[PDB]
Amino acid sequence: HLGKTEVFLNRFALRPLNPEELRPWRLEVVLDPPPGREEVYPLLAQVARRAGGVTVRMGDGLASWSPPEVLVLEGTLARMGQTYAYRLYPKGRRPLDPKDPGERSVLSALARRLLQERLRRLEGVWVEGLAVYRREHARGPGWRVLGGAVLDLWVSDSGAFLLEVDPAYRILCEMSLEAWLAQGHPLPKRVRNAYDRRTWELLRLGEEDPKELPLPGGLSLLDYHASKGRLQGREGGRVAWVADPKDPRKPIPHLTGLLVPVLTLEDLHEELALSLPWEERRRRTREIASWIGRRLGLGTPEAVRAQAYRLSIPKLMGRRAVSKPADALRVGFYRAQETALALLRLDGAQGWPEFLRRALLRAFGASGASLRLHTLHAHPSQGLAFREALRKAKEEGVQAVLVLTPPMAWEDRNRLKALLLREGLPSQILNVPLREEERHRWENALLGLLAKAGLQVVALSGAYPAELAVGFDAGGRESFRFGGAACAVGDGGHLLWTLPEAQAGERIPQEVVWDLLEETLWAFRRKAGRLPSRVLLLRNGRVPQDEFALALEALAREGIAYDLVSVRKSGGGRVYPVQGRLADGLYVPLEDKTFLLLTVHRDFRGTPRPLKLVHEAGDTPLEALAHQIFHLTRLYPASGFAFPRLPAPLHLADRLVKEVGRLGIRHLKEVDREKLFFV
DNA sequence: TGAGGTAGTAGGTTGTATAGT
RNA sequence: AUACAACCGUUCUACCUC
Ligand SMILES: [Mg+2]
Query: Residue with CA nearest B12 C1'?
Result: A476
Distance of CA A554 to the CA centre of its chain: 30
CB A288 within 8 Å of CB A429: no
Give the whole-angstrom CA distance, residue A84 versus residue A76: 6
Which of chain A's residues 130-159 bind strand C, using a 7 Å CB cutoff?
Answer: none
| CA A427 to ligand 1 center in whole angstroms | 9
Strands A316-317 vs A321-322: parallel, antiparallel or unpaired = antiparallel
CB-strand contact A198/C, under 7 Å: yes
| CA A445 to ligand 1 center in whole angstroms | 7
Q: Where are the beta strands (DSSP E) in A494-623?
A: 495-498, 534-539, 561-568, 575-577, 586-589, 594-598, 611-617
Strands A239-243 vs A316-317: parallel, antiparallel or unpaired = unpaired
Phi-psi region of A80 (alpha: psi -120 to 50; beta: other; left: phi over 0): left
Peptide bond into A292 cis (omega under 30): no
Query: Residue with CA nearest C16 C1'?
Result: A604
CB-strand contact A477/C, under 7 Å: no
CB A310 within 8 Å of CB A343: no
CB-strand contact A272/C, under 7 Å: yes
Query: What sign does the dihedral A171-A174-A176-A182 (CA atoms) show?
Result: negative
| CA A471-A473-A474 angle, 5° bins | 150
The helix or strand, by DSSP H or E, that contains position A406, with its residue range, turns out to be none
Give the CA distances from residue A673 to residues A161, A167, A424, A487, A494, in Å, rounded to whole numbers and listed in that order: 51, 43, 11, 10, 11
Q: What is the CATH number of domain A459-662?
A: 3.30.420.10
**SS3 of chain A: helix, strand, coil, percent, to 5:** 30, 30, 45
Nucleotide nearest to A247 (CA to C1'): B11
List bases in chain B with any atom under 7 Å of a protein Cβ: 1-19
Tell me the one-letter amino acid at A531.
Answer: L
Q: Which residues pair with A279 in a beta bridge?
A: none
Longest CA span, chain A: 87
Number of helices followed by number of strands (H, E) in chain A: 15, 32
- 3-state secondary structure at position A669: coil
Task: Please write down the long-range contacts of A144-152, taking CB distance under 8 Å and 24 or more positions apart.
Answer: A144/A172, A144/A174, A145/A169, A145/A170, A145/A171, A145/A172, A145/A268, A145/A274, A146/A170, A146/A172, A148/A288, A149/A284, A149/A285, A149/A288, A151/A115, A151/A292, A152/A112, A152/A115
CB A582 within 8 Å of CB A608: yes
Q: Which residues, other chains included, contact A460 with Cβ-Cβ below 8 Å and sequence gap of 6+?
A: A314, A315, A316, A317, A491, A492, A493, A631, A632, A634, A635
Q: Where are the beta strands (DSSP E) in A389-529?
A: 398-405, 427-431, 459-460, 468-473, 485-489, 495-498
Listing DSSP states for A42-108 in one string gives HHHHHHHHHT-SSEEEETTEEEESS-GGGS--EEEEEETTEEEEEEEEEEEE----TTSHHHHHHHH
Give the whole-angstrom CA distance, residue A440 versus residue A642: 11
Give the CA distances from residue A344 to residues A350, A412, A605, A657, in Å, rounded to whole numbers and listed in that order: 9, 15, 39, 26
The helix or strand, by DSSP H or E, that contains position A210, with its residue range, turns out to be none
Report the residue count for chain A: 679
Our measurement of CA A270 to C1' C11, in angstroms, reads 19
CB A526 within 8 Å of CB A533: no
Resolution in A: 2.9
Phi-psi region of A457 (alpha: psi -120 to 50; beta: other; left: phi over 0): left
| CA A559 to ligand 1 center in whole angstroms | 37
- 3-state secondary structure at position A195: coil
- 3-state secondary structure at position A655: helix
Give the whole-angstrom CA distance, residue A86 versus residue A27: 12
Strands A25-32 vs A82-93: parallel, antiparallel or unpaired = antiparallel
Strands A339-345 vs A485-489: parallel, antiparallel or unpaired = unpaired
- CB burial string A214-233: b at 16+ within 10 A, e below: eeeeeebbbebbbeeebbee
Our measurement of CA A643 to C1' B7, in angstroms, reads 20
| CA A678 to ligand 1 center in whole angstroms | 7
Give the whole-angstrom CA distance, residue A109 versus residue A132: 18
**HSE-CB for A605 with a 13 A CA cutoff:** 5
Give the whole-angstrom CA distance, residue A194 versus residue A231: 11
Q: Where are the beta strands (DSSP E) in A174-286?
A: 190-193, 199-205, 239-243, 252-255, 259-261
List bases in chain C with any atom under 7 Å of a protein Cβ: 1-5, 7-18
| CA A29-A31-A35 angle, 5° bins | 115
| CA A511 to ligand 1 center in whole angstroms | 31
**HSE-CB for A190 with a 13 A CA cutoff:** 15
Q: DSSP label at A248?
A: -
Q: Which residues, other chains included, contact A185 with Cβ-Cβ below 8 Å and sequence gap of 6+?
A: A141, A142
Query: Residue with CA nearest B5 C1'?
Result: A604
Give the whole-angstrom CA distance, residue A494 versus residue A526: 12
Closest by CA position to A111, among listed A153, A152, A159: A153
Q: DSSP label at A150?
A: E
Give the whole-angstrom CA distance, residue A295 versus residue A309: 36
Architecture of domain A177-269: Beta Complex (2.170)
Task: Please write down the long-range contacts of A461-464, taking CB distance under 8 Å and 24 or more positions apart.
Answer: A461/A315, A461/A316, A461/A317, A461/A321, A461/A492, A462/A314, A462/A315, A462/A491, A462/A492, A462/A631, A463/A491, A464/A491, A464/A492, A464/A627, A464/A628, A464/A631
Our measurement of CA A200 to C1' B19, in angstroms, reads 30
Query: What sign does the dihedral A334-A339-A344-A349 (CA atoms) show?
Result: positive
Listing DSSP states for A262-323 in one string gives ---HHHHH--------HHHHHHHHHHHHHHHHHHHT--S-EEEEEEEEEPPPP-EESSSEES
- 3-state secondary structure at position A662: helix
**HSE-CB for A578 with a 13 A CA cutoff:** 10
Tell me the one-letter amino acid at A238.
Answer: R
Give the whole-angstrom CA distance, residue A127 versus residue A486: 41
Q: What is the CATH number of domain A316-453?
A: 3.40.50.2300
Our measurement of CA A195 to C1' C1, in angstroms, reads 21
